[PDB]
């Protein structure tokens, strides 16, 4: 059959990941200009929300030294590639886990509707990949809203997986945080409440 | 109007099949016996129509919807791409590709088909597309079924689609087959066996072709065609 | 040496070729726009001929399964390359034979006189390429007009003949058809009277 | 009533798939994670049913006519065949064989099947055929298409058609597939891969059988089957 | 030392199981004869009881898709091998998973006890093969009986089973339904309270 | 009467000598220009006589008495024996079996043959057999000596024995010739090589078989003859 | 694919096939039972008839040498297999060329009418097998009648003959040879009025 140049094979990020990818939580001096977890300014259009969340291993305990890249439509569901910090907003960002708590946290708008390629609304969610020491090809997963369960209950992604106790996993719960809407999505690598995560 | 400004490769006529082939029966009263008389290439050689401006139906190359009685056609879906190229490995782009096939029981739709598997009453069998700017085509059709015909006691075409391309003029204009990887009827069959070379024999086979597959819907499968070098004339009456 | 790609190879065309390549024959619905065997609009310049034929196998028989490529410059002796059936004349078209008679037919004008790559003028001619079950690949011929013996007897490319009595097998005989100019062309593929076909 | 009265050759289970092989998704959560336990042959394990006398309808092996809706099925007319063996290499006699499988198009006729090629209104998809004295079988049928699977993200079955055989005791029944000789994406499946070793994979695809085929009608393919081999109990309670 | 041709290897029954094997299930018009679900008529001799279970995989999920044939003595604890849909009693059945519920009924008599190859009386028993997408290869289990205590306590098989927790795993639970006598095997695949799976 | 309910598997006429073999100077003008008509197997092709009842003399296999003029006939004593099967391996019992062949010397007892070597007058060089029950059969003879031939001009025929076997039916009779173990007449002559596969010569070679051989009396060759190989009919006219 | 046991490749019969096949012809002595050209006692059912021919090669000369076989129905439409010299009628016979004429002869009666594997009549035919120094492999061929010509338009296996005049070959001329019916059936190997050859 055809075949074609073999996809160069990933590896870890390793522990020291935030060396190159997250300057500061390394220790490290920052260069002028940083991609990172704040992906709106205070003037962006949409729901301003904070989202939260740990990452826990298979036995319980927390990475501590976990790297998070997440993609998100702006609050018209329009995807937004032209990466700027002079942007209100900007569609993509990353995060990590402070060594010490081992929480994340980001800064955004809630994202509006997209449709799959048949057309077929997705309810809002925001596309995470999850980077670190141990894992060999990062993990995909997608965080969706506990405030928005009707759109959750018609979503093709969701629908496609096949036990509905799964797809809890992938629903952030609401809260408040200092007079804000937040959302807590923590990431279950292996075990009791593994979470979803997805080929594509 | 078109010029004489190209030469084209002289054919290997011992690559391409022989006019006669005794094993495929009826090449044995269509084959001349004198030799070919080679002439020298000029305007009326080397030039041929251009189907740009053709006017091509939006399913012309869709053979699971140009035959539409209210259904989708029973059988594999797949798509059939690839790239025609002459011999220095040069783009024919906005080239005229046709084919045509039996449905997937290995019944054409033809009035002196009388084989017994029934006909598909959404499946024709024919489709027709224009090469891109690239040399790039393809279609969308259900693979073809073997069919029996009657040369030998037992014989079976293997699953084939017919290929007719047009190129850059009348010296390159060729009629072929696509055979499917893997196929065991195509060692066995007299028309492929026809081509005295066995390397000759694997250009026509198309290859599975997983990365150009839409998931959940069709396969697809990849054939390239490669038609006379095309070059310049140099040093001509001088 | 230098070797190229090698050439795809031919195969016959088969006996369901009218399916492809001509849908009316077949027993098929036709599409729009469909390449056939009316060369020439009533109104192109030029004289206009009907052209007829039939062909024969080895045993003298009617190859009635038999497709024709044809082409050919304009009555000014130009090839007209912009396939396009709006226009007055087209140089290239197709025919074939009836399942019955085994006679195939073309509406077109007489060509004009074209020169060789020498600067030579060549007698009048059409170019023909013939397709058939078990003909594995095309034949190549040359029509010629019975009417154009002082060309005829000139041209470089009938003078590659060998043997004149061969050239005698690539002229067409005049006729008339209803009061309508009309040229024979018939092809005998193999023995008596074998037509010369070319290599190039 | 039946006896207990001959042993079957232990099966090697690193020759059959093992239970957990995680490229077929499905088999993570369906296989055990402790040791099967290992029990001696007793008449429990070494008799099962014989069906000699089960009422067989007259087209129960023929997939081309056990769905008639008014005309024939669209597909490759196929005759698939074979003897049933076991290890000593001695025929198994009045056995049930049992098949399943999508059309030509590689859709199952099953509510649970949504694949957007069409049902075919005269292939149902099932047969049975009890062997004959001297081990052989054999069915008409449609040669099935490859099916698209929610797996990896661009999977696909090989064409393949489902067997159950019952052999003489609970002991030799096996559910298995049936591949097809050349077919290329035989190699890429994550359930024949499921088999470690190649040679058996091997074991699993059928052969076109020429030998066997209706000229101007349909081709054929030969699967035989081994079943565990039964012997003699020797030396036992002494 | 000697190779035997080897044995056909096993696959996956596959999601479609059904249709060749479960004719009712999958949507399907039935043939006249069926072999199915009712192992003895109303009128055999023995215990009638009602066996129904469900299967769960290894995350606690049912596993609805699943095929399971049955081989068990008649009351007299003879195996009936003949099978004949005429007869008052077969010790052949298969049956399968309901899509909603997930649930298989089997209409059957207590079987009588049988001996080992060495004489020892087992428990009475019905053999269990157990058939589903996902299983590459056929899971061997036993369904034995709770109101059989003292025969369970002594079967040479149950102590083949090494841990006497994993015995209760084969023992069906006796109740009621509709005022007949039934008994619930449940089977757990994988994990907690995993069954006994047997080779032989 | 003889019924239709067998099948002949399809000749492989590329095993078999062609027609037109040049090398083998009389077949130029005695072989057919046209194709082979292929016609489908009816009752007229797939039976055939049962020689069963033919009578047989007592020496009409045995060379060495059958043309007794007061002696034995000069030459090695030879046991020429073997077995008929089908392609499928299957015995083919009670089949006419007869054999041809020159004396010791190369000379045939035949008017048109005027080679200088002598007539033996207690050799006749005609047998005929029955196959037994298991498909067995032998003769007891002299081996044939080499033979000049106006074929090429200094060309030999290798020893050699002609065979005409009945089987079953008009479609697996054949004829053929027995060539002998190590001859090296046999790749230099154009009648063998009227064969162009060198493994289809092969199966025409006799092996020497001192197994068979008669201590102080006579060796023994070994020749098995496979006819096109016979099958039920299945799914014809439905 | 599936590969048998090779056939025994076929060698030509040669000059000589009169020593083990014709044994008359030859010049030696018979023994005393023949398969030869007697089809039929004078007491047989049907039309007794008289069949002669001779056999011509590719420069129409005659072969002398040539041996043939034939296998015909009864009367009746049935082939009789058991053959017997004690038999009013014989379904099979065996004749050869006189090195002198060229000509062969058979005594038999007129073939009643089978029908092909599908049930559709044949004209009545003699199978005829031809053996001759040069002919490699036996040529397949049938014996039709003149007399016949209403049947041989339908049958099914002339009709398998694509060209006309090419079933011509095929049909025996009545005439009368002592006040007997009697056909002449000329074979011609190669060229000119070539026989239909058949593969089966
Ligand atoms: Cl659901
Ligand atoms: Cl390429
Ligand atoms: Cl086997
Ligand atoms: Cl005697
Ligand atoms: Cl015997
Ligand atoms: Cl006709
Ligand atoms: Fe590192
Ligand atoms: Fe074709
Ligand atoms: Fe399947
Ligand atoms: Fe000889």
């Known amino acids: 059959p055809i075949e074609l140049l073999p996809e160069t094979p990933s590896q870890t990020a390793g522990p020291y990941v935030h060396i190159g990818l997250a300057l500061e939580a390394a220790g490290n001096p920052t260069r002028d200009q940083e991609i990172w977890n704040r992906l709106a300014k205070p003037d962006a259009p949409g729901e301003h929300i904070l989202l939260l969340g740990q990452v826990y291993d298979g036995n319980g305990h927390l990475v501590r030294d976990s790297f998070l890249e997440v993609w998100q439509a702006d609050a018209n569901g329009e995807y937004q590639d032209a990466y700027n910090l002079e942007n209100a907003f900007n569609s993509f960002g990353r995060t990590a886990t402070t060594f010490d708590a081992g929480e994340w946290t980001l800064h955004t708008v809630k994202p509006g509707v997209v449709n799959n390629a048949a057309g077929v609304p997705m309810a809002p969610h925001i596309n995470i990949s999850l980077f670190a020491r141990g894992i060999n090809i990062h993990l995909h997963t997608r965080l969706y809203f506990d405030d928005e369960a009707q759109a959750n209950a018609k979503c093709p992604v969701l629908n496609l997986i096949e036990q509905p106790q799964r797809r809890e996993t992938l629903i952030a719960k609401r809260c408040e945080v200092d007079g804000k809407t937040a959302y807590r999505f923590d990431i279950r690598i292996q075990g009791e409440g593994e979470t979803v995560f997805f080929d594509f | ?238």
């Open chain 2, 1 to 238: 109007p078109a010029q004489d400004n190209s030469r084209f490769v002289i054919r290997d006529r011992n690559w391409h099949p022989k006019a006669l082939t005794p094993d495929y029966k009826t090449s044995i009263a269509r084959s001349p016996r004198q030799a070919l008389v080679s002439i020298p290439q000029s305007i009326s050689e080397t030039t041929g129509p251009n189907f740009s401006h053709l006017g091509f139906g939006a399913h012309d190359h869709d053979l699971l919807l140009n035959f539409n009685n209210g259904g989708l056609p029973i059988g594999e879906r797949i798509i059939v791409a690839g790239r025609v190229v002459d011999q220095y490995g040069k783009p024919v782009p906005n080239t005229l590709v046709e084919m045509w096939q039996a449905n997937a029981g290995g019944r054409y739709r033809h009035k002196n088909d009388r084989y017994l598997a029934p006909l598909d009453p959404n499946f024709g069998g024919v489709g027709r597309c224009l090469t891109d700017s690239d040399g790039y085509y393809s279609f969308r059709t259900i693979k073809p079924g073997p069919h029996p015909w009657r040369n030998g006691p037992n014989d079976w075409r293997p699953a084939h689609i017919h290929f007719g391309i047009s190129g850059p003029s009348i010296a390159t204009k060729l009629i072929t087959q696509l055979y499917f990887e893997g196929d065991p009827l195509i060692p066995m069959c007299p028309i492929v066996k026809s081509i005295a070379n066995p390397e000759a024999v694997q250009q026509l086979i198309a290859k599975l072709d997983m990365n150009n597959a839409n998931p959940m819907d069709c396969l697809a499968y990849r054939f390239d065609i490669v038609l006379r070098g095309q070059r310049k004339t140099h040093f001509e009456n001088c």
